[PDB]
Coordinates of C-alpha atoms and ligand atoms in Angstrom, one line a residue:
Chain A
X1 CA 16.5 65.8 -23.9
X2 CA 15.1 62.6 -25.3
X3 CA 17.3 59.7 -24.3
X4 CA 14.8 56.8 -24.4
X5 CA 16.2 55.1 -27.5
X6 CA 13.7 52.2 -27.4
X7 CA 11.1 52.1 -30.2
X8 CA 9.4 48.9 -28.9
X9 CA 12.1 46.9 -30.9
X10 CA 15.3 46.7 -28.8
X11 CA 16.1 43.7 -26.6
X12 CA 16.4 45.9 -23.4
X13 CA 13.1 44.7 -22.0
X14 CA 14.5 41.3 -20.9
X15 CA 15.5 39.6 -17.7
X16 CA 18.9 38.3 -18.9
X17 CA 20.1 41.5 -20.7
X18 CA 21.2 43.5 -17.7
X19 CA 22.4 47.1 -17.5
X20 CA 23.3 49.4 -20.4
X21 CA 23.2 52.9 -21.8
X22 CA 20.7 54.1 -24.4
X23 CA 22.9 55.9 -26.9
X24 CA 22.7 57.1 -30.5
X25 CA 24.8 58.3 -33.4
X26 CA 24.5 59.7 -36.9
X27 CA 24.9 58.2 -40.4
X28 CA 25.4 59.1 -44.0
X29 CA 22.9 59.6 -46.9
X30 CA 22.6 58.3 -50.4
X31 CA 22.0 55.1 -52.3
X32 CA 25.1 53.5 -50.8
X33 CA 24.1 54.6 -47.2
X34 CA 20.7 53.0 -47.3
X35 CA 18.3 55.9 -47.9
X36 CA 17.0 58.0 -50.8
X37 CA 18.0 61.5 -49.5
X38 CA 21.3 63.4 -49.1
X39 CA 20.8 63.9 -45.4
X40 CA 22.2 62.2 -42.2
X41 CA 20.2 59.2 -41.0
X42 CA 19.3 58.4 -37.4
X43 CA 21.1 55.3 -36.3
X44 CA 20.5 54.0 -32.8
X45 CA 22.7 51.6 -30.8
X46 CA 22.4 49.8 -27.5
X47 CA 25.2 48.1 -25.6
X48 CA 25.2 46.0 -22.4
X49 CA 27.2 43.3 -20.5
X50 CA 26.7 39.6 -20.1
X51 CA 28.1 36.7 -18.1
Chain B
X1 CA 3.8 53.3 -52.4
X2 CA 2.8 51.9 -49.1
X3 CA 4.2 53.5 -45.9
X4 CA 6.7 51.0 -44.5
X5 CA 10.5 51.0 -43.9
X6 CA 10.8 48.0 -46.3
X7 CA 12.4 44.6 -45.9
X8 CA 14.7 43.9 -42.9
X9 CA 17.9 42.0 -43.1
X10 CA 19.6 40.6 -39.9
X11 CA 23.2 39.4 -39.5
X12 CA 24.3 36.9 -36.9
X13 CA 27.9 35.8 -36.6
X14 CA 29.0 37.4 -39.9
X15 CA 26.3 35.6 -41.9
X16 CA 23.5 37.6 -43.4
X17 CA 20.1 35.7 -43.4
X18 CA 16.8 36.8 -44.9
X19 CA 14.1 35.5 -42.5
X20 CA 10.4 35.1 -43.3
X21 CA 8.9 36.7 -40.1
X22 CA 10.5 38.9 -37.5
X23 CA 9.0 39.4 -34.1
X24 CA 9.5 39.2 -30.3
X25 CA 7.1 37.1 -28.2
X26 CA 7.0 34.8 -25.2
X27 CA 7.3 31.0 -25.3
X28 CA 7.1 28.3 -22.7
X29 CA 10.4 26.6 -22.0
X30 CA 12.3 24.6 -19.4
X31 CA 15.4 25.2 -17.3
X32 CA 18.3 23.1 -16.1
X33 CA 17.9 21.8 -12.5
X34 CA 20.9 20.3 -10.7
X35 CA 19.9 18.5 -7.5
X36 CA 23.3 17.5 -6.2
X37 CA 22.1 16.7 -2.6
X38 CA 25.4 16.1 -0.9
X39 CA 27.2 14.2 -3.7
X40 CA 30.5 13.8 -1.8
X41 CA 29.9 15.0 1.8
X42 CA 32.7 13.3 3.8
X43 CA 34.3 9.9 3.1
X44 CA 38.0 8.9 3.2
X45 CA 40.1 6.0 4.5
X46 CA 43.5 6.9 5.9
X47 CA 45.7 6.3 8.9
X48 CA 48.4 8.0 10.9
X49 CA 51.9 6.8 11.9
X50 CA 54.9 8.2 13.8
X51 CA 58.5 8.4 12.7
Chain C
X1 CA -2.2 28.2 -1.3
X2 CA -5.9 29.1 -1.4
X3 CA -8.2 28.1 -4.2
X4 CA -11.5 29.7 -5.2
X5 CA -13.8 29.5 -8.2
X6 CA -14.8 32.8 -9.9
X7 CA -18.6 33.3 -9.4
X8 CA -19.2 30.2 -7.3
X9 CA -16.7 30.4 -4.5
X10 CA -14.5 27.8 -2.7
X11 CA -14.5 24.5 -4.5
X12 CA -14.7 21.0 -3.1
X13 CA -11.9 18.7 -2.1
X14 CA -11.4 16.7 -5.3
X15 CA -10.4 19.5 -7.6
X16 CA -8.1 21.1 -5.1
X17 CA -6.5 17.8 -4.3
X18 CA -5.9 17.1 -8.0
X19 CA -4.5 20.7 -8.4
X20 CA -2.1 20.3 -5.5
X21 CA -1.0 16.6 -6.1
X22 CA -1.2 15.8 -9.8
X23 CA 0.3 18.9 -11.4
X24 CA -2.0 19.5 -14.3
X25 CA -3.5 22.5 -12.7
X26 CA -3.6 26.2 -13.8
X27 CA -2.4 29.0 -11.6
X28 CA 0.0 32.0 -11.4
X29 CA 3.7 31.9 -12.0
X30 CA 4.4 30.9 -8.4
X31 CA 2.2 27.9 -8.6
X32 CA 3.6 27.0 -12.0
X33 CA 7.1 27.2 -10.5
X34 CA 6.7 25.4 -7.2
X35 CA 4.4 22.6 -8.3
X36 CA 3.8 22.8 -12.1
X37 CA 0.8 23.8 -14.2
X38 CA -0.9 23.0 -17.5
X39 CA -2.6 25.8 -19.3
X40 CA -3.4 24.2 -22.6
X41 CA -7.0 25.6 -22.4
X42 CA -8.4 22.1 -22.8
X43 CA -12.2 21.3 -22.7
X44 CA -13.4 21.9 -19.2
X45 CA -16.7 23.3 -17.8
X46 CA -15.0 25.1 -14.9
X47 CA -11.7 25.3 -13.0
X48 CA -11.0 26.3 -9.4
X49 CA -8.6 29.3 -9.5
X50 CA -5.8 29.0 -7.0
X51 CA -3.6 31.9 -5.9
Chain D
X1 CA -2.0 54.9 -37.9
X2 CA -5.4 54.3 -39.5
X3 CA -6.9 52.9 -42.7
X4 CA -4.9 51.9 -45.7
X5 CA -7.3 51.7 -48.6
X6 CA -10.9 52.1 -47.3
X7 CA -13.0 51.4 -44.2
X8 CA -15.0 48.3 -43.3
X9 CA -18.3 47.3 -45.0
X10 CA -21.7 47.6 -43.3
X11 CA -22.5 43.9 -43.6
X12 CA -26.3 44.4 -43.3
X13 CA -27.3 40.8 -43.9
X14 CA -26.5 37.8 -41.8
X15 CA -23.7 36.1 -43.8
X16 CA -22.3 37.3 -47.1
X17 CA -20.3 35.2 -49.6
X18 CA -16.6 35.6 -50.0
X19 CA -15.5 35.9 -53.7
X20 CA -12.0 34.7 -54.7
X21 CA -9.4 37.3 -55.5
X22 CA -6.1 37.2 -57.4
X23 CA -4.6 40.7 -57.5
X24 CA -2.6 42.1 -54.6
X25 CA -4.7 45.3 -54.5
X26 CA -8.0 43.6 -53.8
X27 CA -6.3 41.2 -51.3
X28 CA -4.9 44.1 -49.4
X29 CA -8.3 45.8 -49.6
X30 CA -10.1 42.8 -48.1
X31 CA -7.4 42.4 -45.5
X32 CA -7.9 46.0 -44.4
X33 CA -11.7 45.2 -44.0
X34 CA -11.0 42.3 -41.6
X35 CA -12.4 39.7 -44.1
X36 CA -9.5 37.2 -43.7
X37 CA -10.4 36.6 -40.1
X38 CA -14.0 35.9 -41.1
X39 CA -12.7 33.5 -43.7
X40 CA -10.6 31.7 -41.2
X41 CA -13.5 31.5 -38.8
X42 CA -15.7 30.1 -41.6
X43 CA -13.1 27.5 -42.5
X44 CA -12.1 25.7 -39.3
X45 CA -13.9 27.6 -36.5
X46 CA -17.4 27.4 -38.2
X47 CA -18.2 30.8 -36.7
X48 CA -21.2 32.4 -38.4
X49 CA -20.9 36.2 -38.6
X50 CA -18.3 38.9 -39.2
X51 CA -16.1 40.7 -36.7
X52 CA -14.6 44.2 -36.7
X53 CA -17.3 46.3 -38.4
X54 CA -16.0 49.7 -39.5
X55 CA -12.9 49.1 -37.3
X56 CA -10.3 47.9 -39.7
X57 CA -6.9 46.4 -38.8
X58 CA -5.7 49.6 -37.1
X59 CA -8.0 49.3 -34.1
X60 CA -6.7 45.8 -33.2
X61 CA -5.6 45.6 -29.6
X62 CA -2.3 44.1 -28.5
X63 CA -1.1 42.6 -25.2
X64 CA 2.1 44.7 -24.6
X65 CA -0.2 47.8 -25.3
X66 CA 2.9 49.6 -26.9
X67 CA 3.2 48.4 -30.5
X68 CA 5.5 50.6 -32.7
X69 CA 4.8 48.5 -35.8
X70 CA 1.1 49.5 -35.6
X71 CA 2.1 52.9 -36.9
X72 CA 3.6 51.3 -40.0
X73 CA 0.6 50.1 -42.0
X74 CA 2.8 48.5 -44.6
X75 CA 3.9 45.6 -42.3
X76 CA 2.0 42.4 -42.7
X77 CA 0.8 40.3 -39.8
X78 CA 1.5 36.5 -39.8
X79 CA -2.2 35.9 -40.6
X80 CA -1.8 38.2 -43.7
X81 CA 1.3 36.3 -44.6
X82 CA -0.6 33.0 -44.4
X83 CA -3.4 34.6 -46.5
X84 CA -0.8 35.6 -49.1
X85 CA 0.6 32.0 -49.3
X86 CA 4.0 32.7 -47.6
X87 CA 3.7 30.4 -44.6
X88 CA 1.3 27.5 -43.6
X89 CA -1.0 27.9 -40.6
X90 CA -1.4 25.0 -38.2
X91 CA -4.6 23.8 -36.7
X92 CA -5.4 24.2 -33.0
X93 CA -3.7 21.3 -31.3
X94 CA -4.8 20.6 -27.7
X95 CA -1.2 19.7 -26.7
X96 CA 0.0 23.3 -27.2
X97 CA 0.2 25.7 -24.3
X98 CA -1.0 29.4 -24.5
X99 CA 1.0 32.0 -22.7
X100 CA -1.3 33.6 -20.1
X101 CA -1.4 37.2 -19.0
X102 CA -4.0 38.8 -21.2
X103 CA -7.7 38.8 -20.2
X104 CA -9.6 36.8 -22.8
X105 CA -13.0 37.9 -21.3
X106 CA -15.2 39.1 -24.1
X107 CA -12.9 38.1 -26.9
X108 CA -13.8 35.8 -29.8
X109 CA -10.6 34.9 -31.5
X110 CA -6.9 35.2 -30.7
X111 CA -3.7 33.9 -32.4
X112 CA -0.4 32.8 -30.8
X113 CA 2.8 32.1 -32.8
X114 CA 4.1 28.8 -31.5
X115 CA 7.6 27.4 -31.8
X116 CA 6.9 25.0 -34.6
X117 CA 4.6 27.3 -36.6
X118 CA 1.5 29.4 -36.2
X119 CA -1.8 28.3 -34.6
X120 CA -5.1 30.0 -33.9
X121 CA -7.7 29.8 -31.2
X122 CA -11.4 30.9 -31.5
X123 CA -14.9 30.1 -30.3
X124 CA -18.1 29.0 -32.0
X125 CA -21.2 31.2 -32.6
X126 CA -22.7 32.9 -29.6
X127 CA -19.7 32.0 -27.3
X128 CA -16.7 33.8 -26.0
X129 CA -13.7 33.1 -23.8
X130 CA -13.8 33.7 -20.0
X131 CA -11.3 35.6 -17.9
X132 CA -8.9 32.7 -18.2
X133 CA -9.7 31.7 -21.7
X134 CA -10.0 27.9 -21.0
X135 CA -13.5 27.5 -22.4
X136 CA -16.0 29.4 -24.6
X137 CA -18.8 30.7 -22.3
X138 CA -22.1 32.0 -23.5
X139 CA -22.2 35.8 -24.2
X140 CA -25.3 37.9 -25.0
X141 CA -23.3 40.4 -27.0
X142 CA -22.1 37.8 -29.4
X143 CA -25.7 36.9 -30.5
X144 CA -26.0 39.8 -33.0
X145 CA -23.2 38.3 -35.2
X146 CA -21.2 41.6 -35.4
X147 CA -18.3 41.9 -33.0
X148 CA -16.1 45.1 -32.7
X149 CA -12.4 45.1 -33.5
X150 CA -11.3 45.3 -29.9
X151 CA -12.3 41.7 -29.3
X152 CA -9.4 40.5 -31.5
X153 CA -6.0 40.2 -29.7
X154 CA -2.7 39.4 -31.4
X155 CA -0.2 37.8 -29.0
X156 CA 3.1 39.5 -29.5
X157 CA 4.4 42.0 -32.1
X158 CA 5.6 40.1 -35.2
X159 CA 5.8 41.1 -38.9
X160 CA 6.5 38.9 -41.9
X161 CA 8.3 39.5 -45.3
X162 CA 9.4 37.5 -48.3
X163 CA 12.4 35.3 -47.6
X164 CA 15.2 33.6 -49.6
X165 CA 16.2 29.9 -49.3
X166 CA 19.5 29.2 -47.6
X167 CA 21.6 26.0 -47.5
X168 CA 21.3 23.5 -44.7
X169 CA 24.9 24.1 -43.4
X170 CA 24.2 27.7 -42.5
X171 CA 21.0 26.7 -40.7
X172 CA 22.8 23.9 -38.8
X173 CA 25.6 26.3 -37.8
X174 CA 23.0 28.9 -36.6
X175 CA 21.1 26.2 -34.6
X176 CA 24.4 25.0 -33.0
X177 CA 25.4 28.5 -32.0
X178 CA 21.9 29.2 -30.6
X179 CA 21.9 26.0 -28.5
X180 CA 25.4 26.8 -27.3
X181 CA 24.5 30.3 -26.3
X182 CA 21.6 29.0 -24.2
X183 CA 22.7 26.1 -22.0
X184 CA 19.9 26.5 -19.5
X185 CA 17.0 25.9 -22.0
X186 CA 16.3 22.2 -22.4
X187 CA 12.8 21.7 -24.0
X188 CA 10.4 24.0 -25.8
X189 CA 6.8 22.7 -25.9
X190 CA 7.7 19.0 -26.0
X191 CA 10.5 19.5 -28.5
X192 CA 13.9 18.2 -27.7
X193 CA 16.4 21.1 -28.0
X194 CA 19.4 20.3 -25.7
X195 CA 20.6 17.4 -23.4
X196 CA 19.7 17.9 -19.7
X197 CA 19.0 14.4 -18.5
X198 CA 15.7 15.6 -17.1
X199 CA 12.7 17.9 -17.7
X200 CA 11.7 20.7 -15.3
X201 CA 8.5 22.7 -14.8
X202 CA 7.3 25.1 -17.5
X203 CA 8.4 28.7 -17.0
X204 CA 8.0 31.7 -19.3
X205 CA 11.1 33.0 -21.1
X206 CA 11.2 36.2 -23.2
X207 CA 13.5 35.8 -26.3
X208 CA 13.4 36.9 -29.9
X209 CA 13.1 34.4 -32.7
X210 CA 13.0 34.1 -36.5
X211 CA 11.8 31.6 -39.1
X212 CA 13.4 30.3 -42.3
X213 CA 10.6 28.0 -43.3
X214 CA 12.0 25.0 -41.5
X215 CA 10.3 22.8 -38.8
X216 CA 11.6 24.4 -35.6
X217 CA 12.3 28.0 -34.8
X218 CA 15.7 29.7 -34.1
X219 CA 16.1 32.0 -31.1
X220 CA 18.8 34.7 -31.0
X221 CA 19.8 37.2 -28.4
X222 CA 22.3 39.5 -30.0
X223 CA 21.4 40.5 -33.5
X224 CA 21.9 43.5 -35.8
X225 CA 19.1 44.4 -38.2
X226 CA 19.0 46.8 -41.2
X227 CA 15.9 48.1 -43.0
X228 CA 16.3 48.4 -46.8
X229 CA 13.5 49.6 -49.1
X230 CA 15.2 48.7 -52.5
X231 CA 12.3 50.3 -54.3
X232 CA 10.8 46.9 -55.2
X233 CA 7.7 46.7 -57.5
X234 CA 5.9 44.3 -55.1
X235 CA 5.4 47.1 -52.6
Ligands
LIG1 C1 -10.7 28.7 -46.7 O1 -11.8 28.1 -47.5 C2 -11.9 28.7 -48.8 C3 -13.1 28.1 -49.5 O2 -12.8 26.8 -50.0 C4 -10.6 28.4 -49.6 O3 -10.6 29.0 -50.8 C5 -10.2 28.0 -51.8 O4 -8.8 28.1 -52.1 C6 -8.3 27.2 -53.1 C7 -6.8 27.4 -53.2 O5 -6.5 28.2 -54.3 C8 -9.0 27.4 -54.4 O6 -8.6 26.4 -55.3 C9 -10.5 27.3 -54.2 O7 -11.2 27.7 -55.4 C10 -11.0 28.3 -53.1 N1 -12.4 28.1 -52.9 C11 -13.3 29.2 -52.9 C12 -12.7 30.5 -53.2 O8 -14.5 29.0 -52.7 C13 -9.4 28.9 -48.8 O9 -8.2 28.5 -49.4 C14 -9.4 28.4 -47.3 N2 -8.3 28.9 -46.6 C15 -8.1 30.2 -46.3 C16 -6.9 30.6 -45.5 O10 -8.9 31.1 -46.7
LIG2 C1 -27.1 38.1 -47.5 O1 -28.1 39.1 -48.0 C2 -28.9 38.5 -49.0 C3 -29.7 39.6 -49.6 O2 -31.0 39.1 -50.1 C4 -29.8 37.4 -48.4 O3 -29.6 36.2 -49.1 C5 -29.4 37.2 -46.9 O4 -29.9 38.3 -46.2 C6 -27.9 37.0 -46.7 N1 -27.4 35.7 -47.2 C7 -27.2 34.7 -46.3 C8 -27.5 35.0 -44.8 O5 -26.9 33.6 -46.7

């Protein structure tokens, strides 16, 4: 059930950011994908709205 | 090999830049203050006539 | 706004007048926002804390 | 996590000499023993004594109290980057403001990355900051000359890395885009940034930033990062 996708690095802890949804997705593996193992990589993403 | 994710590269506006240090901290700054103070309250010179 | 020195108690009139009138004082965010504040941790033997 | 190479020395005597080192291994070893902070205190702060006995760089406290980069021992602090010759540390100028919020009572040294570089702030021998940190009050616990690792605070979570020079056009475009995306900010620590026809009272503002080795910093709100190892020999 872990949905808190904030490893003390995202910009969600701001006063001008606003509202959003902590989502995540999967990635690929290999030298071209960014890692050194043929396994899916954890890739987090955060979206919000501005004015 | 030391335990670290390695070097980090950030892209901004389609351009990839390799910074020296990456971190999030606070900093003293200023804000924009508009003191209009009734710029144009009410002032007009006109007249009325009958036809 | 009430001022008081830690360990000693209420300060005299000179320091509180300079804190309220000049603007080079040191207080919380409210005092820094309504009147201004200087927190450059300069050389000073003591400072009357206002809150 | 914890240690990287070894623990901290005992430092039985009062003040021990600091031999010069060239290899990366011994420099990392002396960084893990909190010797670089002692060297900085013996260069400009004239502080006699060592700090962080048997504590290492892992027990260093932080202001946000939730530092994810602390679990990654491979990341280098800005002080370590200055010790490695990457950047240049600036002296403690009285015209610079320090962001309040942490309790400096009982602390001996603390660093704060400013907008135009990196500055440090410490006290002399037998003194320590107060609850506000404006002056260095006397402390009985600082008379022994050995201070634990919890008395060292690092304002903000920031890590450094080797960089690559970039042309001036890209930097100018980035600065223009940054100053266009933030029309409310006018001045940062007495540095002209935008045109507002008037200065306002200081107010804290949380925003990320990055350095490219130039004079002023570049703040950015929306940014996408990517961690690559590349299996470099320097690591
Ligand atoms: C702190 O002071 C030491 C002592 O002088 C500095 O070490 C010198 O560094 C220069 C630069 O390479 C050498 O040429 C000298 O031989 C060193 N002196 C020694 C080792 O006694 C050091 O650079 C200063 N700064 C820091 C950040 O440590
Ligand atoms: C370091 O220890 C040596 C050991 O004899 C001695 O000179 C002294 O205790 C210390 N040196 C200092 C304080 O300069």
